Amino acid sequence: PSFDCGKPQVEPKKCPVVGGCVAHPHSWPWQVSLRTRFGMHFCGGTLISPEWVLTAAHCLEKSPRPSSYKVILGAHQEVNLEPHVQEIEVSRLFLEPTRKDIALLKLSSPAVITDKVIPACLPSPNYVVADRTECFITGWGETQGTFGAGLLKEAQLPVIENKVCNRYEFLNGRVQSTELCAGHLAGGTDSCQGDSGGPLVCFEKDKYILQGVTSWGLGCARPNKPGVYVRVSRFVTWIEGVMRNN
């Protein structure tokens, strides 16, 4: 009864987080909710193996102690967790060593891999997602008045190649080679506050590959202001090393 990475057991809704749609429950089984010990959801993450969650480094600035954090796996509701959700304390924190906005959480016990809790697949090292590739972002963040608050949402957004995103009228030189951009130039659909650390995934042949980690933006869903994501492929070698050595 094993489950390959990147293959949801409930097919994602098409949906051609501000804007977008509410996901089918359990169609994004690698999505994590990151919480404090007695606190509510404040960031997302992506399960990448039974003991390891990838998130954004800035999600860890409230506390340098692993005991401050817990991960919720298999969830659909933001607050009223379903009976079968897995809640697991974090045992170790590893921040990316060149100060980029990406981090690994080691879980205190391995997640049980089920039809609702399945890791995402990592990309090949240094792969560059092509301009206009349609990808999906997911999370429980702010919706800015759009429907779906309190439920896991998704949005389908095209990647905008860095050379375009860095133009003066858009993000004006801010985006690094270890980041990527996604969104509609018209605005209206975006990751937002509370989505940080969660996944940006792109479908490839028969499975979803994790290509981005939700990081920052100039606001959310503004015209001419696409969201910025850490480019996961530039960190695969580092991630593999951390898992091998710890």
Partner: peptide, 14 residues
Amino acid sequence: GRCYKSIPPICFPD
């Protein structure tokens, strides 16, 4: 103007 998308957001003057 940059804001990281945590709760609460971490924001910068640019």
